[PDB]
Amino acid sequence: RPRTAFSSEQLARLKREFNENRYLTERRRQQLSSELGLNEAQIKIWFQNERAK
Question: Has domain 1-53 been given CATH number 1.10.10.60?
């Protein structure tokens, strides 16, 4: 788990989600994983990094 390249659609969804709520519950992480085709760890990390910036 170093660097997964998100498609433009994946990133658009994550950015909108982050704008609504910067903190990710496991239940929402599950939904995002399932609706984006990204494993949960990748999503969790993206959220963490997004907050850090």
Answer: yes
